[PDB]
């Protein structure tokens, strides 16, 4: 049919990256589009705010949508600023939180995996911390969060489930299993309750 089988009820990871790329990020421009007091074509986009793009001043931090920050970072015309949660100190704090509370997930942003991957691939030289350590802490967080998920998929009842603080990519990859096992355990229950 119109929509392929693997896109039926889930999002392909490319679509998750597409969704994440619409979030604003803070950049240090390497150009200056701010018209002086004393021609030029303005952005005038339709799905975001062009105000922060027509007023870029070199080495003056602004906020632009991520898919534009990446487009400028394709050249040497900007420098993506890593979010505060993507530092070694904060990653260590989150890892300690995960190791301290074995029943609930840490408060990482919903796009932490996708943003980490995108920034590590396209902005590998804009981190105040060694990227070889940020990768090693992102992987550690992913491992701990995977251990907690496998021990909660052991609570797949037929009423509901509270996956608090879970990210977006993790939810996306767990959707076809959780939402298809709970459906079967609900069909069994409703068949039993046919009286």
């Amino acid at each position: 049919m119109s929509l392929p089988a693997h896109l039926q009820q889930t999002f392909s990871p490319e679509e998750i990256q597409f969704i994440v790329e619409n979030e604003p990020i803070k950049i240090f421009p390497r150009i200056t589009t701010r018209q002086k007091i004393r021609n030029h074509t303005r952005w005038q986009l339709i799905t975001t705010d062009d105000k922060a793009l027509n007023n870029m001043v070199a080495m003056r931090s602004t906020e632009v949508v991520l898919w534009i920050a990446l487009l400028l970072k394709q050249q040497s015309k900007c420098s993506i600023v890593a979010p505060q949660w993507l530092t070694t100190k904060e990653l260590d704090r989150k890892i300690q939180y995960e190791k301290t509370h074995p029943d609930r997930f840490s408060e990482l942003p919903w796009n932490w995996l996708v943003l980490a991957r995108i920034l590590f691939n396209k902005a590998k030289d804009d981190f105040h911390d060694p990227i070889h350590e940020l990768r090693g802490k992102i992987q550690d967080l992913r491992e701990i969060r995977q251990i907690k998920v496998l021990k909660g998929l052991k609570y797949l009842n037929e009423s509901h489930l509270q996956l608090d603080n879970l990210s977006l990519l993790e939810i996306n990859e767990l959707r076809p299993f959780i939402t298809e096992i709970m459906d079967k355990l609900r069909e069994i229950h409703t068949a039993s309750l046919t009286a």
């Binding site: 240090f28 200056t32 018209q35 007091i37 070199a58 080495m59 003056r60 931090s61 015309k77 030289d125």
Partner: protein, 433 residues
Amino acid sequence: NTGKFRYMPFSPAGTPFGFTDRRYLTMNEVGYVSTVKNSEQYSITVSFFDVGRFREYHFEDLFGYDLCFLNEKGTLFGQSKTGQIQYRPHDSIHSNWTKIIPLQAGERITSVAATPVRVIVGTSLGYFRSFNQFGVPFAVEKTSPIVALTAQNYRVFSVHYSQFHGLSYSLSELGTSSKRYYKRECPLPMSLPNINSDMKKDANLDYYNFNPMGIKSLFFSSYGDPCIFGSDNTLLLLSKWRSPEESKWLPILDSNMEIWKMSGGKETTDIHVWPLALAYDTLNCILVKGKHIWPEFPLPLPSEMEIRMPVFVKSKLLEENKEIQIPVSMAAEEEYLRSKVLSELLTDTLENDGEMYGNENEVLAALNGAYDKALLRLFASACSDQNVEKALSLAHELKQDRALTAAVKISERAELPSLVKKINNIREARYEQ
């Protein structure tokens, strides 16, 4: 007769060689310059932040330059001993030239500067030799020994130090056709490193050898306000620099205090600030983490710090002893001070320098709104103590009349019926003012 007598060459935001071949000659707001030894001589590399108007280049160097200075139209190179200076405009329409400075016994070039009107070379003896853009000399003058230089588009700012006259600055605007002076050898409040130089320091000895006076940079502002950074780690602005009688040295930032209040509570010393430029609360400075004060070849991202007055009292800040909590009573007062100084600075450039970006009026209006909001908060705080005279005195500085009506409401609501009549009288006086 030693130590501070060594007029060793200095360029803005310089760097020592340290334990490697990489050295940063200059870090202006428009780029940085690095040198690496090819096992027998240096190869200069000049990079620019605003990629889109300039293009970085690297060239073989045989003289082993020690001084550099970057403008928006050209960069100038200098040498410490036998100081043959070289000036090279970025654009190819202007041809670069080299010149040999008159060197005497014990003489050594300390700092160099350039300006689209004239190019200025320093001298340990205290000479003020100047040339045109193309190298032809214009005038030779002798002053107190120049130790640093930094120039804006048309204005030149220098600090003169001597063992007898002390640290004296001088802000001279050469101008296109009018050499209008604004200061000359005036005393300055920068604290030279003396106690910290008494053989008690770790890894700072090499940097102090590189720069005896420890002054990290003399960068301007986006509106021409001179700024000073050094060992004390506090910015020094010239608020009313237009009038020589109105000279004002205001410490606008406190690096150590801000670092402590953002570090979680520890008095961390492993964080060092290398300022590059300031533009309306936007201080761009590399925050190196480690035992080495100067950065490395992969220059880190210029993280931005905001200006903060040294009004933060430790006694008040240690209310929650260990996201450091801030006393709300003093936070609003500090915001008031910041808005006041920023409005005063903007007004100076409003009528004189004219509009710069087309939004100075709007940002000034928003700043004035915040200025009166801080006054309203302080008025409410004074009313909380049932001090009617305190609120009355604070209400005379209100600018917007709508803020004064809000003050009337605060007086009529904060258990102060007596303040109602006085604030209403102030408002009625403002009717005719």
